[PDB]
Amino acid sequence: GQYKLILNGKTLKGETTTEAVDAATAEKVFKQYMNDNGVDGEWTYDDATKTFTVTE
């Protein structure tokens, strides 16, 4: 499925997608990207829309 990340960071912001077999995998892919950019924050995932929203 196509999963989405809405990233509301202090120095990095945007909206991106990835294909992933499941939500657990999408979470890991997005966390890898966030970690590489030094971004972490509060977050929510809505399974109905396959969307993670992160707010630093």
From Swiss-Prot:
Sequence repeats: 3-56
Domain of life: Bacteria
Subcellular location: Secreted, Cell wall
Annotated protein name in UniProt: Immunoglobulin G-binding protein G
Species annotation: Streptococcus sp. group G
Gene name of the encoded protein: spg
